[PDB]
Design a protein around this ligand. Structure first.
Ligand SMILES: *[C@@H]1O[C@H](CO)[C@@H](O[C@@H]2O[C@H](CO)[C@@H](O)[C@H](O)[C@H]2NC(C)=O)[C@H](O)[C@H]1NC(C)=O
Ligand SMILES: *[C@@H]1O[C@H](CO)[C@@H](O[C@@H]2O[C@H](CO)[C@@H](O)[C@H](O)[C@H]2NC(C)=O)[C@H](O)[C@H]1NC(C)=O
Ligand SMILES: *[C@@H]1O[C@H](CO)[C@@H](O[C@@H]2O[C@H](CO)[C@@H](O)[C@H](O)[C@H]2NC(C)=O)[C@H](O)[C@H]1NC(C)=O
Ligand SMILES: *[C@@H]1O[C@H](CO)[C@@H](O[C@@H]2O[C@H](CO)[C@@H](O)[C@H](O)[C@H]2NC(C)=O)[C@H](O)[C@H]1NC(C)=O
Ligand SMILES: *[C@@H]1O[C@H](CO)[C@@H](O[C@@H]2O[C@H](CO)[C@@H](O)[C@H](O)[C@H]2NC(C)=O)[C@H](O)[C@H]1NC(C)=O
Ligand SMILES: *[C@@H]1O[C@H](CO)[C@@H](O)[C@H](O)[C@H]1NC(C)=O
Ligand SMILES: *[C@@H]1O[C@H](CO)[C@@H](O)[C@H](O)[C@H]1NC(C)=O
Ligand SMILES: *[C@@H]1O[C@H](CO)[C@@H](O)[C@H](O)[C@H]1NC(C)=O
Ligand SMILES: *[C@@H]1O[C@H](CO)[C@@H](O)[C@H](O)[C@H]1NC(C)=O
Ligand SMILES: *[C@@H]1O[C@H](CO)[C@@H](O)[C@H](O)[C@H]1NC(C)=O
Ligand SMILES: *[C@@H]1O[C@H](CO)[C@@H](O)[C@H](O)[C@H]1NC(C)=O
Ligand SMILES: *[C@@H]1O[C@H](CO)[C@@H](O)[C@H](O)[C@H]1NC(C)=O
Ligand SMILES: *[C@@H]1O[C@H](CO)[C@@H](O)[C@H](O)[C@H]1NC(C)=O
Ligand SMILES: *[C@@H]1O[C@H](CO)[C@@H](O)[C@H](O)[C@H]1NC(C)=O
Ligand SMILES: *[C@@H]1O[C@H](CO)[C@@H](O)[C@H](O)[C@H]1NC(C)=O
Ligand SMILES: *[C@@H]1O[C@H](CO)[C@@H](O)[C@H](O)[C@H]1NC(C)=O
Ligand SMILES: *[C@@H]1O[C@H](CO)[C@@H](O)[C@H](O)[C@H]1NC(C)=O
Ligand SMILES: *[C@@H]1O[C@H](CO)[C@@H](O)[C@H](O)[C@H]1NC(C)=O
Lengths: 1021, 273, 50, 50
């Protein structure tokens, strides 16, 4: 009866070759994993809906399905497309037919009950004859022939694919693209179709197409190999939104949820009287244009479809509105300006027009809303002897304002002379007339013109169109229409006290806040029905295709379900246990993929909770330490792009360039900004790396006290003398539109030489090469100074020198192992590359946009259209592409500022971390800084920060001071500790107890002042 | 535009994590507040609030004060979580000095910690102990004065209030732009659509689309620039946290004017004090 | 920025008064809107760079 | 190109390749080489050679 559809409904949307690209297209496709009807029967079929397009598929072994019928009645009464394959060729006809039996075609061929006539044919096509399977066979099917049948604007598009199969059961799973084959211009309104079966079995599938958006993957050979149905599910929406088939772990915003209306609400005043249009259009006599009439039409039901459909009118031109929308709109008042004019003067009755009537007798506003209605009256107002009862004002000393009625009869003066009702030179009358006779010319015949002026709704409306009202439903999302004002939202009761004259309320945005119900004068608030963005929480597609959906800022009762302050989270199980944050949701909630396995949501942990065993006489002092190496990765530079604004916008087009010149310096200001950026990328690089006045090199003998630097020093065997670690870093980070990339000034080899010099200086001369000359020093002694710099006596290093070197070497090895396996380690630098690449890919894609033009391709506009019309379309494209460049450049300037700040920070670290020793906490890594080593990286720098971290501690009893002979002895830069029986003095950051003597302590004051002073003895050497 | 705004929203949480999430563990003070006479009751959490914030933090929070496609996302770190981080940083500073920043938190008497801070400015530790009671009273009085100042002068937090105002002003302007015609017959799209039909309506709509899109581009650009300013401030705040609270700063006027001893963080709306 | 005032931006003339003194509102308003759009975009660019 | 395909396209929707209408072979279209030209010069206060 039914089966599960699969990845079979994909066809080539057009005939353009694309390869190695993911292309997003919207067309009528079969939704993935939808239900498709299975029609089987062994030992005619029904008439099916076409549903704006039909997916059809069949499995064959003997060519049982041999044709299709498409139409409305499909019975010799309308044109109906008939496609038949009768062992010779495909025959397509749209002829009528008498189906004097349940049509099917029988098997060689010995039966033909499909038809017995051919009458009133308007199209016939026959392909070349072939020969195929006809005799009776039964079993597994051998050939699956899939088809798509769609009707677009009268064109019947047929797509198909034939493929070998070895399968009797349901549809095979597997991607297969459908090529286009036929486009038939027929123009038939198709609502139903039927199939044709061959009787000596039955097997075929019928699906239906829907307006889905698909993301199509074209491989290197231009064959469609996959597709994503966006509205299939949140994961598919995410993949198409990001235009990729792989989604990294995280949360993405892909769409917006909106509760849809369930029913419409149409509300109008309960008026039964009809508007007296007949008394104006069929008036016995029209007024003269010098004295035009204004009839008010109000408190009635108006129907403008009668006037519009009537063919008796010579013109019906609406300004501001248009004639088929007038039925759903209503007005506070409509006024009818009624007068007779000359035919040739109809053009003057319009906004923006001038002339002796437009200026002297009937002026319209240039913002006029309404309709100009006209018809000739040559058989009513014109008379033999002429009709001289219609007067117009020939002369006036001034023009007229809109809707002014100038009834005055003052004597007009051409020049300047007194007139007192006299007809004389420069004493003329403003009143003139025409003598209209049925025999006068076309332009001299009378026309009856009525202009209907509509005053936009503001106040309660009384003259409304023929739309009937409905009942009102509160507290539900509805699509409402109140007196022509439309929108979607939930209508609720309100406490807004509208004044008796007020009809509408407004929000800050001028949107409707509340309405007065036109039937019952109560005030209803309009709150649009709940909506919000929808985010998809997913582990990467390299792990699982299971996702959770977050509906932002909604309640869960308006749609496992977890209510959070971020929204309603669907698909994630709520876990009481806290963990480290993984994929953030918001409001303290994070999600992760963990174990059966599922996506979980939890309140994030801030770290383990602990307490410090504080007391007024207890100090913890470390007895051992660890040397750790951390990696700090900073962007320094970004790719130095340069864009030819002219070639991008106006590629190889003189006409476009000439139009572009009317926009001035916009281009050169973009070239200037990008040049400035490109230059500053090199300034940034020089400031970070060119901090050494000379190029230093290490000695051939690497006698550095056991410290192994072979993985950070250049390896004299590479085409570019980079270290092992640098090679690892470089192995982790991965045009004809006026878009170029400039090379950097400093090549990678030169950067490596600078980092080599900085490293060799640091190793052989410590910090001295930074301040001035490089002064050689044994490395172990350099470390001794670095230890003194953190309050640790140099003797600690020498005594543990071998241990320290091994820890250092091991730490370096661990970095290498980390860098060799974890690609994400350099994400901070990879993102910069991605951001610049994304910016360019977007920019290039903008060239495909129309921006309102007929075509995105400039040459296609130019080769078909000529300048007076072509220039407008080109200006539209220029505006769009120029705005795109302005956006790109602005984003690059902001990003460049971010990079500059990072480069300045990197230079600061280089100066304070590598050339010196930093006293700034966590500036040169967490811990007590010893030394740092630079390594170069693509568009960036990596610092290896060597830090001293206390490793093991004991609880010792302490005291701020010791009493001896009543004098208070305090330690000379150390602390007092007790092992329970004896007091010792020791350095703060490393347990090394010494006997308390007068050379370790100093005396100030006496025992009665110091809080916590203890009794002891002080040894005097 | 959605991408740019998402990037901003994300970086606001990165900024918060970098400023506050500088401690690997959540520390808590002992039940006995024997800190040598130094009174911290106005900066430590008060175990009685719906959100365990200090008195001063409550004062700070009491001073700082949609259907058009405009939404506000919640922060990842709620105010309670921020308070827990500041509590941990404060407890670490008090009970272990700077040791919790470099590595493990090593307990030390507070008076001795101050002795080290005094040595760090070239003042022998004996000065503190001999004047320890005086110093504690001065500290306690100074804290009380802060409370009195914060309790009466609303303008004290103007630097943070302006940020709120700038974002609010930006949105109010943006929403108001929907009322503009931009050359169209009406700013209301539905009123154009219900009276005019496609060959003429599409032009008026394109005019409104152009105007509203330009308005968004302007808003987003201003937000990106403002966000860069905020990021610089957050980086500075993180730097101070690292050098002022976790350590002791030798940088003149970096951690206030005078010779720096110690600093204490307090959370505030969209900021740190 | 000042030089941008000399640009037509598709208008018949960069000088606003020359448009206004020869053309009347139903046609003049379009040319003026073209100049307003261009000059406003120029200011937006200037302010952003500043 | 598949037998029904006549044109190829680039990311920008520009033509990548064409099927020759007289002989059905596929030809790639690569715009002829172009690029910016920069002038390296000492200041005109020294020399006019570039
Ligand atoms: C200090 O810690 C280091 C390790 O960080 C200790 O060295 C380890 O000592 C054990 C002895 O039990 C050896 O088995 C390990 O192989 C050593 N590790 C390394 C890397 O050499 C050192 O002994 C500790 N010292 C003290 C006094 O506790
Ligand atoms: C510094 O460490 C490197 C680590 O690779 C040592 O080089 C290794 O040396 C051993 C023998 O000494 C070889 O068996 C390995 O194959 C080498 N590895 C590589 C990657 O070359 C180097 O010898 C150490 N330096 C010193 C002075 O011992
Ligand atoms: C505290 O340290 C002292 C100094 O090392 C310890 O004293 C000595 O103890 C050893 C036996 O462990 C004797 O052989 C020495 O002669 C002692 N010397 C002195 C000067 O007393 C003392 O035992 C330690 N106390 C604890 C509890 O560990
Ligand atoms: C340190 O030792 C001195 C004397 O050796 C202690 O002072 C004595 O204090 C007790 C109790 O107050 C008196 O009874 C003695 O007469 C005092 N003797 C002298 C010489 O002053 C002092 O109290 C001790 N410190 C502590 C903390 O107990
Ligand atoms: C630290 O200072 C606070 C200041 O408020 C002290 O709490 C006050 O304590 C006194 C009595 O000790 C009460 O009368 C006040 O009402 C308290 N004020 C508040 C706001 O609670 C606190 O006791 C001081 N700490 C110590 C150890 O003395
Ligand atoms: C297939 O159709 C049946 C009813 O005909 C329906 O209950 C079922 O849910 C459909 N399949 C899917 C996957 O929705
Ligand atoms: C199929 O129909 C065509 C119609 O012209 C006919 O010529 C052909 O012979 C038929 N095929 C047979 C009889 O196998
Ligand atoms: C078909 O042909 C007949 C000729 O007898 C003609 O009268 C009729 O109008 C034509 N059209 C239809 C739809 O029957
Ligand atoms: C097609 O025919 C149906 C009647 O079956 C009718 O309702 C529909 O409006 C027709 N389509 C057109 C475009 O007239
Ligand atoms: C593309 O065609 C070539 C034939 O030269 C073939 O070797 C290659 O595997 C094909 N690629 C795909 C993805 O089918
Ligand atoms: C006014 O509207 C109500 C709503 O149902 C209707 O019953 C009433 O008859 C209307 N008034 C007139 C005069 O028709
Ligand atoms: C005018 O009168 C004619 C008949 O003389 C009638 O058919 C027409 O509908 C009338 N028009 C109006 C607006 O009353
Ligand atoms: C991601 O995919 C690659 C190749 O499919 C695989 O080697 C890698 O282990 C995957 N990632 C994880 C975390 O397993
Ligand atoms: C919606 O959220 C409110 C918030 O207080 C809650 O009280 C209510 O029960 C939730 N569910 C509904 C309205 O169905
Ligand atoms: C988690 O805690 C809640 C307390 O509100 C409790 O109702 C729930 O059953 C707990 N779940 C588990 C698995 O412990
Ligand atoms: C110090 O003493 C406290 C007392 O409870 C203990 O919890 C803590 O672990 C001790 N420190 C070490 C390093 O063992
Ligand atoms: C430490 O605190 C205890 C409280 O149990 C007190 O008796 C002792 O005198 C205090 N010592 C110092 C030095 O403050
Ligand atoms: C530049 O020109 C001025 C005046 O012509 C001259 O004095 C100056 O020396 C020139 N610069 C150099 C580097 O000679």
């Amino acid at each position: 009866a039914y089966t599960n559809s699969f990845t079979r409904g994909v066809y080539y949307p057009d005939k353009v070759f694309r390869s190695s690209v993911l292309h997003s297209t919207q067309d009528l496709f079969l939704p993935f994993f939808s239900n498709v009807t299975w029609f089987h029967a062994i030992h005619d079929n029904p008439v099916l809906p076409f549903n704006d397009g039909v997916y059809f598929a069949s499995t064959e072994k003997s060519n049982i399905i041999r044709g299709w019928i498409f139409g409305t009645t499909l019975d010799s009464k309308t044109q109906s497309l008939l496609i038949v394959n009768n062992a010779t060729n495909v025959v397509i006809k749209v002829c009528e037919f008498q189906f004097c039996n349940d049509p099917f075609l029988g098997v060689m061929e010995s039966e033909f009950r499909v038809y017995s006539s051919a009458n009133n044919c308007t199209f016939e096509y026959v392909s070349q004859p072939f020969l195929m399977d006809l005799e009776g066979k039964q079993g597994n099917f051998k050939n699956l022939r899939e088809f798509v049948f769609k009707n677009i604007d009268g064109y019947f598009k047929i797509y198909s694919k034939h493929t070998p199969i070895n399968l009797v059961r349901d549809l095979p799973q597997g991607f297969s693209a459908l090529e286009p084959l036929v486009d038939l211009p027929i123009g038939i309104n198709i609502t139903r179709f039927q199939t044709l079966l061959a009787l000596h079995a039955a097997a075929y599938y019928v699906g239906y197409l829907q307006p889905r958006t698909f993301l199509l993957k074209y491989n290197e050979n231009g064959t469609i190999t996959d597709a994503v149905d966006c509205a299939l599910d949140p994961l598919s929406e995410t993949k198409c939104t990001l235009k990729s088939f792989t989604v990294e772990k995280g949360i993405y915003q892909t769409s917006n949820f909106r509760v849809q209306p369930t029913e419409s609400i149409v509300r109008f005043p309960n008026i039964t009287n009809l508007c007296p249009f007949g008394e104006v259009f069929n008036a016995t006599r029209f007024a003269s244009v010098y004295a035009w009439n204004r009839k008010r039409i109000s408190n009635c039901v108006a129907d403008y479809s009668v006037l519009y459909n009537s063919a008796s009118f010579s013109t019906f031109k609406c300004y501001g509105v248009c004639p088929t929308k007038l039925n759903d709109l209503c007005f506070t008042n409509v006024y009818a300006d009624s007068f007779v004019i000359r035919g040739d003067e109809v053009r003057q009755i319009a906004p923006g027009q001038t002339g002796k009537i437009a200026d002297y007798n009937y002026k319209l506003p240039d913002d006029f809303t309404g309709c100009v209605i006209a018809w000739n009256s040559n058989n009513l107002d014109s008379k033999v002897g002429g009709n001289y009862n219609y007067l117009y004002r020939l002369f006036r000393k001034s023009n007229l304002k809109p809707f002014e009625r100038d009834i005055s009869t003052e004597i007009y003066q051409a020049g300047s002379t007194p007139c007192n009702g006299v007809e004389g030179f420069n004493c003329y009358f403003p009143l003139q007339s025409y003598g209209f006779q049925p025999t006068n010319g076309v332009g001299y015949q009378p026309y009856r013109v009525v202009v209907l002026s509509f005053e936009l709704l503001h106040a309660p409306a009384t003259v409304c169109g023929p739309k009937k009202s409905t009942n009102l439903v509160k507290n539900k999302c509805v699509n409402f229409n109140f007196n022509g004002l439309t929108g979607t939202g939930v209508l609720t009761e309100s406490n807004k006290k509208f004044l008796p004259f007020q009809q509408f309320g407004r929000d800050i945005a001028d949107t409707t806040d509340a309405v007065r119900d036109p039937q019952t004068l109560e005030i209803l608030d309009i709150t649009p029905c709940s909506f919000g963005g929808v985010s998809v929480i997913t582990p990467g597609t390299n792990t699982s295709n299971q996702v959770a959906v977050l509906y932002q800022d909604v309640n869960c009762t308006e749609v496992n379900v977890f209510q959070t302050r971020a929204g309603c989270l669907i698909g994630a199980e709520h876990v009481n246990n806290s963990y480290e944050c993984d994929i953030p949701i918001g409001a303290g909630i994070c999600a992760s993929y963990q174990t059966s396995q599922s996506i979980i949501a939890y309140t994030m942990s801030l770290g383990a909770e602990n307490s410090v065993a504080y007391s007024n006489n207890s100090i913890a002092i470390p007895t051992n330490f660890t040397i750790s190496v951390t990696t700090e990765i900073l962007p320094v530079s970004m790719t130095k792009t340069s864009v030819d604004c002219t070639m991008y916008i106006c590629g190889d087009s003189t006409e476009c360039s000439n139009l572009l010149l009317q926009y001035g310096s916009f281009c050169t200001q973009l070239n200037r900004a990008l040049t400035g950026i490109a230059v500053e990328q090199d300034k940034n690089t020089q400031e970070v790396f060119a901090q050494v006045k000379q190029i230093y090199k290490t000695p051939p003998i690497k006698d550095f006290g056991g410290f192994n630097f072979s993985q950070i020093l250049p390896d004299p065997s590479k085409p570019s003398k980079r270290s092992f670690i640098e090679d690892l870093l470089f192995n982790k980070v991965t045009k004809f539109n006026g878009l170029t990339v400039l090379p950097p000034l400093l090549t990678d080899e030169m950067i490596a030489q600078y980092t080599s010099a900085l490293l060799a200086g640091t190793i052989t001369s410590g910090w001295t090469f930074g301040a001035g000359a490089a002064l050689q020093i044994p490395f172990a002694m350099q470390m001794a100074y670095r230890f003194n710099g953190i309050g640790v006596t140099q003797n600690v290093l020498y005594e543990n020198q071998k241990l320290i070197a091994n820890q250092f070497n091991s730490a370096i090895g661990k970095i290498q192992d980390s860098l060799s396996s974890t690609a994400s380690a350099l994400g901070k630098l990879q993102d910069v590359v991605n951001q610049n690449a994304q910016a360019l890919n977007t920019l290039v894609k903008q060239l495909s946009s129309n921006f309102g033009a007929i075509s995105s391709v400039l040459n296609d506009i130019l080769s078909r259209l000529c300048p007076p019309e072509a220039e407008v379309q080109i200006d539209r494209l220029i505006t769009g592409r120029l705005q795109s460049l302005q956006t790109y450049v602005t984003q690059q300037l902001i990003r460049a500022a971010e990079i500059r700040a990072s480069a300045n920070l990197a230079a600061t670290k280089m100066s304070e971390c590598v050339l010196g020793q930093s006293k700034r906490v966590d500036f040169c890594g967490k811990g007590y800084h010893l030394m740092s080593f630079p390594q170069s990286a693509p568009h960036g720098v990596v610092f290896l920060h060597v830090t001293y971290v206390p490793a093991q501690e004991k609880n010792f009893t302490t005291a701020p001071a010791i009493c001896h002979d009543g004098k208070a002895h305090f330690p000379r830069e150390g602390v007092f500790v007790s092992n329970g029986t004896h007091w010792f003095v020791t350095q703060r950051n490393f347990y090394e107890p010494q006997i308390i003597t007068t050379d370790n302590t100093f005396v100030s004051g006496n025992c009665d002042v110091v809080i916590g002073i203890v009794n002891n003895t002080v040894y005097d050497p």
